[PDB]
Amino acid sequence: TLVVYEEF
Amino acid sequence: CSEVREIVLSLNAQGVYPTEGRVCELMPNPGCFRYKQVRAAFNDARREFGL
Amino acid sequence: STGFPLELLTRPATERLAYFENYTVAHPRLKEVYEILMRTIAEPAGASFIFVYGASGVGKTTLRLRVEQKLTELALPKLESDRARVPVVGIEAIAPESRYFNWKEYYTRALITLEEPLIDHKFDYGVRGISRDNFGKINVESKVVAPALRRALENALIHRHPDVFFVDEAQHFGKVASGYKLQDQLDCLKSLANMTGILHCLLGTYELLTFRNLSGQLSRRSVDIHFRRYCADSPEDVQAFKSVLLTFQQHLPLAETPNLVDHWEYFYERTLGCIGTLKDWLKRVLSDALDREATTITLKDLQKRALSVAQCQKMFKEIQEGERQLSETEADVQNLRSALGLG
Amino acid sequence: STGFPLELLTRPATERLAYFENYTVAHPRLKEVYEILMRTIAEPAGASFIFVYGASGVGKTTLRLRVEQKLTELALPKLESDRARVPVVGIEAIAPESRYFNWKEYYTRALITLEEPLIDHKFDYGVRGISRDNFGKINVESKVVAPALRRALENALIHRHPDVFFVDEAQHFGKVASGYKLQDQLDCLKSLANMTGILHCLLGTYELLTFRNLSGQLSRRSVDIHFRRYCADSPEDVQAFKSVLLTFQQHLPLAETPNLVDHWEYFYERTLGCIGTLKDWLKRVLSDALDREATTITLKDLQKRALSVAQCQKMFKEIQEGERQLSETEADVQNLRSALGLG
Ligand SMILES: Nc1ncnc2c1ncn2[C@@H]1O[C@H](COP(=O)(O)OP(=O)(O)OP(=O)(O)O)[C@@H](O)[C@H]1O
Ligand SMILES: Nc1ncnc2c1ncn2[C@@H]1O[C@H](COP(=O)(O)OP(=O)(O)OP(=O)(O)O)[C@@H](O)[C@H]1O
Ligand SMILES: [Mg+2]
Ligand SMILES: [Mg+2]
């Protein structure tokens, strides 16, 4: 499963 | 002599070192210091404020 | 959603490029580093230095920018009432054009960047030759020798009390002559920081590792942080690289999203796991695509804008010589225990 | 009771953080060193300098603060009959930016800190170029030649006649050019102490040990005072470390009691027995816990804000060198006896 990060 | 006194006072108030040349440069007749009392007054003011 | 808004599909190339450039991602490495730096900033507890080591292009400067931005909202509500205070200040060291470092220029630049809050505020530095002209630019005479500038900077730093003094590109402090020692330069910096009571955060490449553990004082006096890259030798770093590639792919303002997950290997070849290098490569290739008017991204445009072989060779050599000195092993812990006698 | 007051539980976190910050424990080594330093300051018996060695974070600066406030408090009741005298002056030297240690800047800093309180009067050092200002701070011109500044400081020190000249971070006196023996550097202050009658108490780390015995004339008027950590070889020092750990833990503003007593070894290796390091580490952990509202302090919360093993090894090497330098055995007494001829 590939995770999706948020904006810093 | 008074005018020299306020000149050195204001010059030190702004922050510059009040020297003979700087005081002369902002006084209309910068040759009066040949008088044996005007230079004495300037030196006395400098000593009073600590030079 | 999880990517760029669809409205950006009707704009010019400049808007897409600006949106992508003003887009910063939060990988777990950056998240942990940001959290511990924020916690250290909150309460240094007698720490004079926070050295920030990391590979060139890992994200040091963006982390510093976000830190100052955060410091500016943790202060603004408390800056509505209080005044004569700045949240955070920064400066970048000047590489000297002579054989030796110019400390006088450092002091002058620090005084220039520190003291410009508002024309209304006035304060006497006690040094003859420092004033503010009619244009509101702090001017320093050419004859003010280094100790006088140091005293003026000390007074200004005490008056202003920033939460931290950021010194980026700190390795330039090492440009010294034969007899000059690095401990002397770091001791001058430590004396400044301790006398003004302002925490100093030095950021730079692994060359700044020459300023680490010099003396016992400079040593205790220090919280060393490390902005490590992602390494292919661990599954977690590889997976995080793939995930950041996926989120970049979904945040590339194009009608068709390119598949950058499968091309991670070559990616890691030219980026060394550094997210900043990856971002600059991606933004370059996006500018290329939007100039050529290409809907998606292909490998040829990736190879037309990647770094050279020798550049990556030297980068990885420096990175290896850096990480070799910033690793903790149980053998060192037991060695210290035995030397102290705790074992 | 013997711990933190319960009413601090409803207080804001800033109050608890500050309260632990200014909280002090009179651990036995600090007590003994304060006693000997006070007794040596009270009368100098011709002594020109007192060397107070120690590691980084031992508590030299807290020592100086306590001693200075004490001398001020004793001098306050008697400062009405005899004015024109300062009880104690406290300075810390500047690490030079040039190769040479700037003597003129040392003299300038000393005269300001000496004469900078009220306008009780004046002294008129009789040296031109030195004065105060409308803001009340003494300002001297860059044209005042260093012998003139020395004479002005001489007259000011003979008037003020302070009990002691505090000089923290005195190891910075060693930063001298090549071919210039540290002897003459110490004799520069020796002449000042001899023709002003003021004893100069120099603190600092073990790097000051290069100033110990240069000439017999220097060593005769000197008092050696050594701040030492808690060595792990004897169990009395281990019990002292345990007891101060209890004292520190007892006044931690925590809802539940963090049993830090069990892991005394981990505290020891990350602190090296220098109580300042433990104070800073516990303060960092307290700040993090108050941010996270933690009911107790656990092991991970202790190991995030702990010193790196490399810094610990470097400072420990410095400590071992210093303890080797400041070691006296009966054998040395026997050698002195045999050399004199008393045998
Ligand atoms: N997490 C990130 N998300 C998006 N862009 C990033 C991120 N980190 C870095 N960048 C981008 O990478 C580029 C260069 O990185 P950065 O300025 O942070 O360099 P640095 O790590 O401080 O390195 P150097 O020591 O070489 O100056 C910038 O365009 C910056 O916006
Ligand atoms: N008895 C004590 N109780 C509590 N905290 C203490 C005590 N002694 C020292 N400390 C802590 O140690 C910290 C650092 O100690 P101090 O500044 O005296 O070190 P130093 O040995 O003079 O350092 P340096 O060698 O780096 O100049 C203080 O800020 C204080 O928090
Ligand atoms: Mg940079
Ligand atoms: Mg100190």
From TrEMBL, chain A:
It comes from the Bacteria. This is Integrase. It comes from Nostoc sp. 'Peltigera membranacea cyanobiont' 210A.
UniProtKB/TrEMBL annotation, chain B:
It comes from the Bacteria. This is Uncharacterized protein. It comes from Nostoc sp. 'Peltigera membranacea cyanobiont' 210A.
TrEMBL record, chains C, D:
Mg(2+) 3 binds at residues 61, 168-169. Mg(2+) 1 binds at residue 61. Keywords: ATP-binding, Metal-binding, Nucleotide-binding. ATP 3 binds at residues 25, 27, 56-62, 217, 220-221, 279-280, 283. ATP 2 binds at residues 24-25, 27, 56-62, 217, 220-221, 279-280, 283. ATP 4 binds at residues 25, 56-57, 59-61, 221. Mg(2+) 4 binds at residues 61, 169. The keyword Metal-binding applies. Mg(2+) 2 binds at residues 61, 168. The keyword Nucleotide-binding applies. ATP 1 binds at residues 21, 24-25, 57-62, 279. ATP 5 binds at residues 25, 56, 59-60, 62, 217. This is Uncharacterized protein. The lineage of its organism: Bacteria, Bacillati, Cyanobacteriota, Cyanophyceae, Nostocales.
